[PDB]
């Protein structure tokens, strides 16, 4: 319920501080736009937006929409980095392709990473994502 978190539209600490919001960019109304945007959040006793991350879809834009947007991009960086590393491993000189990146091969993989979650599920089902424990270098216990 967050009884100790008043909304920022009815928070007197935020209302006395939103009129003195500074401009972060060259726009002279940057502090006014931030005052209207942060009014919909939940504020504490010091009039700053406290974010709720527990899983409520009312506060889905606090963490879940950052979570969905991050994991897509971070999955994209990991998947095209993994797929480039697999492709250059089959070449004559796999070592030199890491310090001297085959840039046309890199752009080909990086634009193909928009369908990484469908490619990750399919490669997990095919067994080419996860290696078996018998086929991996192992410490001597």
């Amino acid at each position: 319920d967050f009884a100790n978190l008043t909304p920022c539209s009815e928070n007197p600490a935020y209302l006395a501080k939103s009129k003195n919001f500074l401009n972060t960019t060259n726009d002279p109304n940057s502090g006014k736009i931030r005052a209207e945007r942060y009014a919909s959040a939940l504020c504490g006793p010091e009039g700053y937006p406290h974010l709720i991350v527990d899983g409520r879809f009312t506060h889905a834009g606090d963490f879940l929409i950052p979570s969905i947007l991050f994991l897509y991009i971070a999955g994209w960086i990991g998947w095209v980095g993994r797929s480039y590393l697999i492709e250059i491993r089959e070449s004559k000189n796999p070592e030199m392709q890491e310090v001297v990146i085959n840039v046309p091969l890199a752009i080909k993989k990086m634009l193909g990473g928009f369908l990484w979650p469908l490619a990750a599920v399919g490669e997990y089902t095919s067994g080419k994502l996860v290696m078996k424990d018998s086929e991996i270098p192992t410490s001597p216990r």
Partner: protein
Amino acid sequence: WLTFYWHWKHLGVWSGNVAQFNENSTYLMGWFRDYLWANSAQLINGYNPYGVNNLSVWAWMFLFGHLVWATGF
């Protein structure tokens, strides 16, 4: 980290100024200024050119601990 947290939260609770911890602990300058620099004021004045008080041994120990910690380096 945890004893800095315990001490600074309880310093607000014991003085009644819980908002000093609540508005400053979220960034590390608030820990550095409102906890480390602010609360060390009477500690480092345990002895001064103008005399001593009961925090003189704790002032000497606090610098003694700095010496032993840096000698370990």
